[PDB]
Amino acid sequence: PELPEVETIRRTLLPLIVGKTIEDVRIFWPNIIRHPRDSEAFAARMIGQTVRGLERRGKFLKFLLDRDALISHLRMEGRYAVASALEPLEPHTHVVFCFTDGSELRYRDVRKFGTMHVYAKEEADRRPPLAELGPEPLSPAFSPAVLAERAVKTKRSVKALLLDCTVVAGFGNIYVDESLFRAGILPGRPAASLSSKEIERLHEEMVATIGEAVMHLYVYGRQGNPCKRCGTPIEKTVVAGRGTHYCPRCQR
DNA sequence: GGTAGACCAGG
DNA sequence: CCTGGTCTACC
Ligand SMILES: [Zn+2]
């Protein structure tokens, strides 16, 4: 899921688990657990803790318990559901948190690509994978000024910059391409080649792209199709070693 | 320190 | 062999 879908998950999942006390944690694919390294330590420390909150940082979900925070990344196919302990698990269920009321928070992931880290709450923000994560795109912490400062420093293309998670949280290939199209900027442009005007415009489009979604594509996956704003065929190349979609007319 | 890109597994 | 987000590991 993209950031906005993750936010939707955070919102709808919270009431379904808040106030629930963990009685057991069952792990069927240990590699998902990245911290503590030993999945057994992971399971044992969570038992007895009550879910108190659920926050989002970038595309990470941060489950708040009594003492610990669980940092969860769904990656490609990860999904959470709350269901009865009495019913059969759905296919590809790799982690289950069992609550004392007989319900369960289940993590499914056909790809097995998702990750989980647990730390004492007060440590979560200064350890991987949250450490160094850039500002929320919809926060005043993410500003044209912040953006401009990073652009000037680097020899990187603008796309490479926006894909950098220390720059801003939750911007993947899709939103980068879309934001760059909406800002009229070619992805292969050097980040340092962007004018202050282009920086402002880009920041604005980024925020709008994320903001609107947290509530139709122009270029992503539309190569060979007419651009929706000028009709020029959308093209696809490789920038920052990535599948990059752009309009050769709208973007400069 | 700044950077590209290596890798979680399976469709 | 391919996707990708991002933490790692290259110099
Ligand atoms: Zn166009």
Let me know the largest β-sheet.
Answer: 5 strands, mixed
Rg over alpha carbons: 20 Å
The CATH topology of the largest domain is: N-terminal domain of MutM-like DNA repair proteins
- Outline type: elongated
Report how far apart the termini are.
Answer: 29 Å
Count of the domains: 2
EC number: 3.2.2.23, 4.2.99.18
Domain Formamidopyrimidine-DNA glycosylase catalytic: 1-114
Subunit structure: Monomer.
GO biological process, one term: base-excision repair
How would you characterize this protein structure?
- With 252 residues, the chain is of the alpha+beta class.
- It folds into 2 domains: 1-132, Alpha-Beta Barrel (N-terminal domain of MutM-like DNA repair proteins); 133-252, Helicase, Ruva Protein, domain 3, CATH 1.10.8.
- It has helices spanning 3-17, 39-46, 121-124, 144-153, 158-162, 173-182, 196-213, and strands at 22-27, 33-35, 53-57, 60-64, 68-73, 79-84, 93-99, 103-108, 115-120, 235-239, 242-246.
- The chain has a 5-stranded mixed β-sheet with strand order 2-9-5-4-3. Strands 1-7-8-6 form a 4-stranded antiparallel β-sheet. Strands 10-11 form a two-stranded antiparallel ribbon.
- The chain binds a DNA duplex (11 and 11 nucleotides) through loops.
- It is classed as hydrolase/dna.
Essential attributes:
alpha+beta, four-stranded antiparallel beta sheet, 252 residues, DNA repair, 2 domains, DNA damage, Helicase, Ruva Protein, domain 3, 11 strands, binds zinc ion, multifunctional enzyme, N-terminal domain of MutM-like DNA repair proteins, five-stranded mixed beta sheet, elongated, DNA-binding
